[PDB]
Amino acid sequence: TFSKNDVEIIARETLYRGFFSLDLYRFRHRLFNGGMSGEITREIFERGHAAVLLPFDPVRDEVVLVEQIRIAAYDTSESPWLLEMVAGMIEAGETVEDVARREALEEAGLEVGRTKPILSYLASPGGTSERLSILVGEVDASTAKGEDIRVHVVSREQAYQWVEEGKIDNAASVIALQWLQLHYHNLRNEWT
Amino acid sequence: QQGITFSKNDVEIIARETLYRGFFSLDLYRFRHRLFNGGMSGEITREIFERGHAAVLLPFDPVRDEVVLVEQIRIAAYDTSESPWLLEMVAGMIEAGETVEDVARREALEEAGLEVGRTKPILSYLASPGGTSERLSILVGEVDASTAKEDIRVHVVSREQAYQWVEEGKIDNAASVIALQWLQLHYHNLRNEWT
Ligand SMILES: Nc1ncnc2c1ncn2[C@H]1C[C@H](O)[C@@H](COP(=O)(O)OP(=O)(O)OP(=O)(O)O)O1
Ligand SMILES: Nc1ncnc2c1ncn2[C@H]1C[C@H](O)[C@@H](COP(=O)(O)OP(=O)(O)OP(=O)(O)O)O1
Numbered sequence: 503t504f505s506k507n508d509v510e511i512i513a514r515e516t517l518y519r520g521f522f523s524l525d526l527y528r529f530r531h532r533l534f535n536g537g538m539s540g541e542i543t544r545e546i547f548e549r550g551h552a553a554v555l556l557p558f559d560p561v562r563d564e565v566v567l568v569e570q571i572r573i574a575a576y577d578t579s580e581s582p583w584l585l586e587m588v589a590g591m592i593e594a595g596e597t598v599e600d601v602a603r604r605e606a607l608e609e610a611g612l613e614v615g616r617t618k619p620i621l622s623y624l625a626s627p628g629g630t631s632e633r634l635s636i637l638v639g640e641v642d643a644s645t646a647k648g649e650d651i652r653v654h655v656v657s658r659e660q661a662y663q664w665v666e667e668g669k670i671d672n673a674a675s676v677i678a679l680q681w682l683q684l685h686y687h688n689l690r691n692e693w694t
Numbered sequence: 695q696q697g698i699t700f701s702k703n704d705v706e707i708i709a710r711e712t713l714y715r716g717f718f719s720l721d722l723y724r725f726r727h728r729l730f731n732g733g734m735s736g737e738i739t740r741e742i743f744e745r746g747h748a749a750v751l752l753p754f755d756p757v758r759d760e761v762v763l764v765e766q767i768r769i770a771a772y773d774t775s776e777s778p779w780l781l782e783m784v785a786g787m788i789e790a791g792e793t794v795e796d797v798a799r800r801e802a803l804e805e806a807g808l809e810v811g812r813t814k815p816i817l818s819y820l821a822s823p824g825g826t827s828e829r830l831s832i833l834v835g836e837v838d839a840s841t842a843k844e845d846i847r848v849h850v851v852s853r854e855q856a857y858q859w860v861e862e863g864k865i866d867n868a869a870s871v872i873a874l875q876w877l878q879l880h881y882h883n884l885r886n887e888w889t
């Protein structure tokens with residue numbers, strides 16, 4: 503419906519600057535019934551953007567997971583140690599593919615063969631700008647060995663069962679493994 | 695395999711510090727945790743964006759095989775999206791003492807004018823646990839899509855179209871991606887159960 507010409511970003515006021523940033527967006531935007539809004543302000547968490555890799559072995563039908571503590575999970579989770587996808591922050595001028603492949607090697611010792619885009623998503627766009635771009639990457643699960651990080655090699659079915667049971671419940675891994683559950687048959691044919 | 699190794703007993707949160715307090719907060723977590731090789735970590739600090747937690751409702755009409763989406767501006771999408779107006783699930787913050795289902799039904803009525811019949815849990819996920827504590831708990835809710843009526847516009851589309859838009863990237867916020875991928879995996883049984 504509406505485009506960026508229908509929004510006026512008046513200011514971005516730094517509320518906090520540390521490792522991450524918190525900015526106050528001051529803006530006006532067009533209304534569905536006509537006209538422009540008044541001035542609106544929103545606190546937005548700015549932490550850059552990330553690349554995500556689902557390491558999938560199409561020959562063996564196995565996924566490689568990585569385990570590490572995420573203290574932000576503490577208050578609402580059984581444990582702050584999460585089972586996650588390979589992922590890393592994207593710095594200026596870097597590509598999703600470069601970051602994804604680099605992180606797979608350094609976080610899991612995985613050489614990546616072919617890749618395909620899965621999806622790129624906004625983690626929580628009401629309060630943060632963060633975008634994460636997911637690839638699926640062809641890996642040899644027998645070469646996975648491995649910031650304190652532990653590598654897990656599991657069947658695809660087990661990984662998806664853990665999504666269903668809530669044992670895997672971070673957005674990137676849920677999105678990637680749900681996508682795999684929807685596409686693994688065609689993906690295994692294509693990569694075999 | 696076994697799964698995760700350590701539990702909350704294996705981490706020591708030494709202190710928390712509010713670095714910024716406004717509508718939301720930025721807190722500094724200070725903690726120590728055991729290492730996979732057996733030893734103890736050093737003292738660690740992390741900036742964590744604290745904004746409470748949310749309830750999400752996927753409004754699904756099993757008779758018509760349609761979903762109801764809500765469109766509204768999310769300014770934070772501006773920098774990485776062609777448009778900051780997003781197609782989203784019904785959603786609202788959970789305040790103390792409220793249940794997910796209570797918020798979900800209330801938000802469904804006031805964001806989309808929808809009375810909700812039966813509900814089922816989909817999933818509860820951490821939006822981005824490296825830097826924010828936020829958890830969002832998703833339910834699917836039985837609605838009559840023909841009755842579907844913050845500046846918010848209500849959209850009614852078939853499940854296949856909505857899932858196509860996930861694949862095309864036109865729906866690309868986590869809550870809606872997770873819910874609609876789940877729907878694509880479960881709609882057959884859900885339609886049987888609710889018919
Ligand atoms: N929430 C946070 N608040 C403050 N600093 C953080 C936060 N999360 C991570 N950091 C810092 C700590 C680390 O020095 C740096 C990157 O951490 P980490 O992800 O463990 O490194 P890495 O290079 O092994 O992995 P990757 O590149 O995949 O992110 O970011
Ligand atoms: N990032 C933000 N910074 C400051 N205020 C905000 C922010 N996001 C939302 N608000 C305020 C504006 C609204 O008056 C109030 C709730 O907004 P709205 O999105 O319509 O409701 P909601 O129940 O869906 O909340 P939420 O999006 O937090 O889940 O929160």
Ligand SMILES: [Mg+2]
Binds near residue numbers: 588589590609
């Ligand atoms: Mg990582």
Ligand SMILES: [Mg+2]
Binds near residue numbers: 785786801805844
């Ligand atoms: Mg609302």
